[PDB]
């Protein structure tokens, strides 16, 4: 939908839609915060896919309104005026909207206005699952949340805990950094490696039967769409890094086996199993905020049968996992993403990049995302759709 120079899109015939999706994919569910972060009657602002939104909790249920008055385009959040439980009144000329359907139900500055009941502020579906707030940034009735979530994230027994933050890089650079088989080289000195006695090679190199290591999923019953990188089951572990034949670096020879299988799913969520411990799983999203930033929504799952277990897990999370894994391990992924910004900033990195064997999995992802995304977000979606 024209976000990139046409000359570049013409060059990347294998995945032009993906290269063009600088603002992300429209018509998909995206996690933006945790349930505990949004309280009853306290609207919270955020930007998703370039759009400013407002989220409010009313009678325990979440509602989402575009944070931009229909009148003069100001953000309602500049000065929040929720004068009745079910509505929000713009601070400027008092146009009032219902949280449930966005209908302009009243205008305090002119209760006789012909606009009343005849205009509607954009609303977006909101759903809470596993203590995470998901917003369907799309049009029409939303598909099942499961379609845009990795396998097992929604298991009844699966206890989800995590953290979220804003990172300065396009979402795609985050995705590819995460689903990259050979990038773990940057984690070779992470405190998680030693402090958790992990077995971690310098690089999971491509085995022989390539299409046996990569598994494209487009037959998932709930509609999921993604790609598996079967490094542990079909890939090769490089534990001794050599230069000129001499060993200059070694991987970690710990006892804990992790990262058996990695998978990337639309709209942009990675699943690492098992990780950071053999009895856990990591699910992380790279949510588009605008063309230069994304939410790095990290979650760790661990089956729990009772509160006593949930509490224990919650304690380990706070004292070990979050500090040693989400931060100790993944922090290097943050500046790694930032490091690729300049090369791709002008969109030319998508042409000049020189890929090697382990990037085969990334290429598969680009084609899958290009073929199965539910829409390309455009700046026009942000300012107001245009058509003659």
């Amino acid at each position: 939908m024209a976000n990139v120079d046409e000359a570049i899109l013409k060059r990347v015939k294998g995945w032009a839609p993906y290269v063009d999706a600088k603002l992300g994919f429209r018509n998909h569910w995206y996690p933006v915060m945790f349930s505990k972060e949004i309280n009853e009657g306290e609207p919270k602002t955020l930007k998703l896919l370039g759009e400013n939104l407002l989220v409010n909790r009313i009678d325990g249920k979440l509602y989402c309104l575009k944070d931009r008055c229909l009148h003069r385009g100001v953000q309602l959040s500049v000065k929040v005026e929720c004068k009745t439980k079910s509505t929000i009144t713009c601070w400027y000329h008092a146009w009032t909207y219902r949280w449930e359907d966005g209908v302009l139900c009243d205008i305090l500055t002119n209760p006789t206005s012909a606009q009343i009941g005849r205009q509607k502020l954009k609303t977006y579906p909101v759903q809470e699952a596993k203590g995470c707030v998901f917003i369907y940034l799309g049009d029409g009735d939303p598909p099942p949340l499961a379609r845009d979530t990795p396998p097992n994230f929604l298991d009844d027994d699966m206890e989800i805990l995590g953290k979220n933050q804003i990172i300065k890089s396009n979402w795609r650079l985050a995705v590819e950094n995460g689903f990259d088989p050979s990038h773990i080289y940057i984690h070779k000195d992470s405190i998680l490696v030693k402090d958790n006695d992990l077995a971690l090679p310098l690089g999971f190199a491509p085995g022989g039967d390539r299409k046996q290591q990569t598994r494209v999923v487009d037959d998932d019953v709930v509609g999921r769409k993604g790609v598996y990188d079967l490094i542990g089951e079909h890939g090769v572990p490089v534990f001794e890094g050599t230069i000129g034949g001499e060993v200059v670096r070694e991987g970690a020879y710990g006892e804990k086996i992790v990262a058996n299988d990695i998978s990337i799913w639309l709209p942009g969520v990675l699943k690492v199993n098992p990780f950071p411990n053999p009895d856990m799983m990591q699910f992380e999203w790279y949510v588009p905020i605008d063309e230069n930033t994304h939410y790095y929504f990290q979650t760790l799952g661990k089956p729990c049968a009772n509160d006593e277990e949930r509490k224990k897990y919650e304690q380990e999370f706070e004292s070990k996992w979050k500090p040693m894994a989400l931060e100790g391990f993944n922090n290097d992924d943050i500046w790694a993403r930032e490091a690729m910004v300049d090369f791709y900033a002008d969109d030319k990195g998508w042409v000049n990049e020189i890929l090697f064997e382990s990037d085969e999995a990334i290429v598969a992802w680009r084609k899958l995302a290009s073929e199965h995304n539910q829409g390309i977000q455009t700046q026009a979606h942000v300012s107001g759709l245009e058509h003659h």
């Binding site: 012909a114 005849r118 205009q119 107001g384 759709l385 245009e386 058509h387 003659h388």
Partner: protein, 104 residues
Amino acid sequence: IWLKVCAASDMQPGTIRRVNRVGAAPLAVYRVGDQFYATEDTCTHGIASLSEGTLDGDVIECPFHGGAFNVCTGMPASSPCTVPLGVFEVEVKEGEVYVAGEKK
């Protein structure tokens, strides 16, 4: 039930004629060739008077922001318009054009 607008002959094809009604919102009568149509005069996207716009075939273009509507269906034809225009019934009885007091 109906109101006298004008003589079908006073309107050249492709022209617009505003119909002010006592105690109510104005309407716009369009002559697209030999057929006459009617919608509310006020653009649903704001407060502009469509009778001051430009008629291209059966599509009316608002003077304020360039939004447009199909004068036959009242459906939006060009952004930023999104809200259907109210359409009124018109009748040319004895070379004279009449517009329904209420919208169909």
